[PDB]
Write a protein that binds this DNA or RNA. Structure first.
Lengths: 93, 271, 46, 37
RNA sequence: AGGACCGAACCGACUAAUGUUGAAAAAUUAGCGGAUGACUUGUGGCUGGGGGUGAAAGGCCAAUCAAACCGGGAGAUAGCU
RNA sequence: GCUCGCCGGAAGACCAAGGGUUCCUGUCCAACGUUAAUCGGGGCAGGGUGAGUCGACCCCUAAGGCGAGGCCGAAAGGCGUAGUCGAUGGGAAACAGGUUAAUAUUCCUGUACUUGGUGUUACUGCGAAGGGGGGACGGAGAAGGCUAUGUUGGCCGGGCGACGGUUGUCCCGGUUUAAGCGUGUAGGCUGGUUUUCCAGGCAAAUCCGGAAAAUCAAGGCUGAGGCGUGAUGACGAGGCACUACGGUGCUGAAGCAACAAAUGCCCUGCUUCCAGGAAAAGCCUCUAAGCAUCAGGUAACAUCAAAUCGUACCCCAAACCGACACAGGUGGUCAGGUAGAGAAUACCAAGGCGCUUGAGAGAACUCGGGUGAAGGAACUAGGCAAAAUGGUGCCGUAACUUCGGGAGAAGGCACGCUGAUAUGUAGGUGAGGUCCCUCGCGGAUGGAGCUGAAAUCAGUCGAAGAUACCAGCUGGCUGCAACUGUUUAUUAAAAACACAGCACUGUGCAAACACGAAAGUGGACGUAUACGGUGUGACGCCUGCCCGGUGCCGGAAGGUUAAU
């Protein structure tokens, strides 16, 4: 099993957008920003054990950071990971 | 059978083929084949060491039995095959215990023909046996120079070696060069002469034929600049020098043997 | 017209990359001069 | 712009081309020299 | 069948005109040669500087080649400007 | 938004490489955009890339790299065995439909498939850095069977028409459906089965190889496509209801046949030719050591797992390489209509564009073109440039020749449209029916239907019927080079280089020779019918004399002659 100390550090934020919103209200999937080194077994286990719901399957993409600039000083943001967590028929959050 | 091609399209005007209807039209025997990668004339330093080599057709190596070690077991010649690595043809043979091997094909040898290696072999063409058992004045090919080593003399097509003497532990051999050489008399040799003599009668006809045997062009020395070849330069055709290699050593006469280790074994140089 | 720089990442790295500078004496001296000059990117890796 | 202007002034500083004056300028100087001989 | 014939792709580059502070540090347009072969091409690899490679022109080796580029000896030396 | 023009083997679509947010939405016009800009690949913010099946990673290897020991080398280091890496190659598996502003073989719907783990049950000999098979692989050519795809008819829905006619031999549109599973066909290959024996596959072997018999004449392997199912589902021209007029839902007819047909598939086939055409693993098998009522193997069922990284967007380009939003360069994949031999060319479809300065005027002159009286190379260094020729069929065709050519020599004639032969022939395809059955994806007959050259005769139109585009100028004498090729990237493509062929010469294998302080490597896993060097340069007739000089080869007597 995955230890609970690992399993708390994985989920990072709920992702709020309109693709996320239509995924919830149309296909049971909650979209959430996860740890960059988090595997699909860790995300599945962490939503099973931290929101106490039943997860059908996880799909993970990794989002690349945008090169912004302040003034005349550039900088890339930071890569993050986004997990499309497809729940079962019985869920709320 | 040599055949002049009819002169449709130049390039075919001067070609003479050497066709052989008794060669096997088909794939060779597979577990006696191996990969033979082409080099380009270039050593482990990458450099061109032998010039004029490169390109040509892909070839697979055929493990030809030069040693002829299966003594006393007869072998029937299964077929004859084209070998790309040699001038001669190779015969695929089948020993009585179910082992196939390729040998160099001697002159008269056809399919369905008994050959036999070893000391008590009959003297007839195809039988490898030591030269203390071969009669003096017999044509013999695939000669070993050290006993047990493998054949190295008279392997190329239409080539034989005549045994002229048996003085003691040595046999004096008239090599195809014209050179008289002493070989130890325990060295095996195969009877007869090796058999695609008409190989020398083919004429190739065009430039691309040389190209497809892997022979890149030869720029002649006098066509170069003086930095390139010792022959070099000169305002139209201009030779004026004693003819040399591209490294300055005299071509046209100058003897380049220095061994001193194998001079014991040379009875007379060639002429 | 076909210019000289025809890029390939795999040849960039196999040729001038870090594991290829570290692979020999003189490339390690290259990295030593780039570190000593103090240089934001040593090799060309990414 | 200043960096591109310094480098793009630095373009024909190490040239070789002999029929072109200063590396780039077309002329007839081959025929002028050749006719002078 | 063919280093076969005509001819597109594809490779090339014979002529002319334009262009020559170009649209382009070598092209465009109209014709032109090869076009199953000694062809052409993709990806990778190997050869290195008095060295490579060269169907040989002193050609090519990163718009550089009768000896690359970078750094150093080095503020070479300059009876010359 | 309506018209107009351009590309349409691309100026459309999909990628690889390369780039790296340029993608999509809102917002701003300072600078960037060769002008203005409300617009933008610009600024700012937000959003966006979803995989057991696609690709990478992974398993295996080529060229080649690195390389424990090792051999070698003043040191650095060179080479290399075991090994280990290295794709551009070999290895398991997913398709259709729908959806987002922006992803989709990834999400959703439906239907699937693959490989491992574990468990149960039934049977059971399993077991390798080892043996065998297989993987496993050339160029060209030829058909045959198909399909993608298209055309026409039928069917279904809609229209009867701004200007003469248009209820019909009329017009517009649609007529689509996959993987998987089942069947096993047109082909292609091979005799099959049983028993005994063996100097081979380092050992063993029931596997492979081999040698005997005996019997049967068939079995096996492979294989496009079709057919059935998937699918009483989806999709579907269009209508219906609301309509932030952007669309959003609902409903939805027919959904067939004939012919033509690939450069795709059977085909890694078949025929043929020399120039003789990767490897290793997965895969199938054999056993050795061992384990043998255990472990393991096989089969069925159930259950679990299939991680990680890529996925946006451009990709013949305003996003890559070219300093530029540059008339340049850049690999693969798809490839509709009409005419055509065709991927040429013309005009078009799908789709995409009008090239990020415009408005005038209508001088010289320059550039790109059109036409030209009479003449017709007089131009000029030179017919440079332009003009001309140009297709298919048939007739006809010289010198010379290596007997192949020359030759498309040269030079001519025919060509449209309509009608008849013949309400479209010869030919191709071929239904229903009929006959037989080793009964079906069968063969024989039969010709409905579809497709359809080419020729002759008759007529008719125009100045002209290869009407556009496309598409040889021809002949005579001669120098050089035999020929195809190669070369000065960027003023020289040539008579120069190359070449087949010839000769001379070296080279006996630890070969000469070359790269290398050496080890070693190439020569070559070649062996004098071979290899290296040099010259000449197809072929035909030939290649004369000179060995005093320089070189080379040979000789050893004498003279001179180093280190010692």
């Amino acid at each position: 099993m995955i230890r609970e100390e690992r399993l708390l550090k994985v989920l990072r934020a709920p992702h709020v957008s309109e693709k996320a919103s239509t995924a919830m209200e149309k296909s049971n999937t909650i979209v959430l920003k996860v740890a960059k080194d988090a595997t699909k077994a860790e995300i599945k286990a962490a939503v099973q054990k931290l929101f106490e719901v039943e997860v059908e399957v996880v799909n993970t993409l990794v989002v690349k950071g945008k090169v912004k600039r302040h003034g005349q000083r550039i900088g890339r943001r930071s890569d993050w990971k986004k997990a499309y967590v497809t729940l079962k028929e019985g869920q709320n959050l | 059978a040599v055949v002049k091609c009819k002169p449709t399209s130049p390039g075919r005007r001067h070609v003479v083929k050497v066709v052989n209807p008794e060669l096997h039209k088909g794939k060779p025997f597979a577990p006696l084949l191996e990969k033979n990668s082409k080099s380009g004339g270039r050593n482990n330093n990458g450099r061109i060491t032998t010039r004029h080599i490169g390109g040509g057709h892909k070839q697979a190596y055929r493990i030809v039995d030069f040693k002829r070690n299966k003594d006393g077991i007869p072998a029937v010649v299964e077929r004859l095959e084209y070998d790309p690595n040699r001038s001669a043809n190779i015969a695929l043979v089948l020993y009585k215990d179910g082992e196939r091997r390729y040998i160099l094909a001697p002159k008269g040898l056809k399919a369905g023909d008994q050959i036999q290696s070893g000391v008590d072999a009959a003297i007839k063409p195809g039988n490898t046996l030591p030269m203390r058992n071969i009669p003096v004045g017999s044509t013999v090919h695939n000669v070993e120079m050290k006993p047990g080593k493998g054949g190295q003399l008279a392997r190329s097509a239409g080539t034989y070696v005549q045994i002229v003497a048996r003085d003691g532990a040595y046999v004096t051999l008239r090599l195809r060069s014209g050179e008289m050489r002493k070989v130890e008399a325990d060295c095996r040799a195969t009877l007869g002469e090796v058999g695609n003599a008409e190989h020398m009668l083919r004429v190739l006809g065009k430039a691309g034929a040389a190209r497809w045997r892997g022979v890149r062009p030869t720029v002649r020395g006098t066509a170069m600049n003086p930095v390139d070849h010792p022959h070099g330069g000169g305002e139209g055709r201009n030779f004026g020098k004693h003819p040399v290699t591209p490294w300055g050593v005299q071509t046209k006469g100058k003897k380049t043997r220095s061994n001193k280790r194998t001079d014991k074994f040379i009875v007379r140089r060639r002429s | 017209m076909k210019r000289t720089f025809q890029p390939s990442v795999l040849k960039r790295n196999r040729s001038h990359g870090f594991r290829a500078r570290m692979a020999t004496k003189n490339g390690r001296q290259v990295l030593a001069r780039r570190r000593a000059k103090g240089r934001a990117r040593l090799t060309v890796s990414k | 712009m200043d960096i591109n202007w310094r480098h793009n002034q630095s373009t024909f500083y190490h040239f070789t081309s002999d029929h072109r004056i200063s590396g780039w300028k077309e002329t007839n100087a081959m025929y002028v020299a050749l006719n002078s001989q």
